[PDB]
Design a protein around this ligand. Sequence first.
Ligand SMILES: CCn1c2ccc(C[NH2+]C)cc2c2ccc(-c3cnoc3)cc21
Ligand SMILES: [Zn+2]
Length: 196
Amino acid sequence: SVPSQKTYQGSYGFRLGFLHSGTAKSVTCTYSPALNKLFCQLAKTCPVQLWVDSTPPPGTRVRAMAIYKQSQHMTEVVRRCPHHERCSDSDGLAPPQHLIRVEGNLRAEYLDDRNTFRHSVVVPCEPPEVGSDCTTIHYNYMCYSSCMGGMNRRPILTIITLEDSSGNLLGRDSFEVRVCACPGRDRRTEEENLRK
Ligand SMILES: CCn1c2ccc(C[NH2+]C)cc2c2ccc(-c3cnoc3)cc21
Ligand SMILES: [Zn+2]
């Protein structure tokens, strides 16, 4: 099966937000609103903001999962490639097979679904720090889009779901991801292709 990617704000008005990082050659993570696409370097911090219009209950959680974007590949589990799953870059918590990690959150939990075999990472939903308007999760993507035997140049989506304590759906948002060596140049190139 294929997890839903339908945008759903739900009762709490859940949606993502992204910083405005620009497209300089040196940028390590940059988001294109026109493409709804995040471009990032391998294993580098990707800040993703969480926004709600009203406060969700204690025990609400936030899950991230990757799927292939193209219909002919969406049934295949997105995982790290045969090299990266063996490179012993573990953070002590993420299984080495998982593409998506959460950085710097000791409460992150990693799921291998017993039925679909898909990977996901889930954290408690926390309120913004005093003085802030939103909460930020720091994600890492642990393979390049081009990795042979893994993503192998196939585009992926990240689906972020807001869930209750049982795992029921409260909200959903999503964005395409390209993990690449030069996110700034690739964002500029793909945005110009879209314009042309
Ligand atoms: C999704 C993260 N988030 C927000 C993001 C933006 C804004 C709006 N600021 C102007 C408010 C919240 C907010 C309020 C409460 C909680 C909460 C309580 N208990 O668990 C989670 C989580 C919250
Ligand atoms: Zn890889």
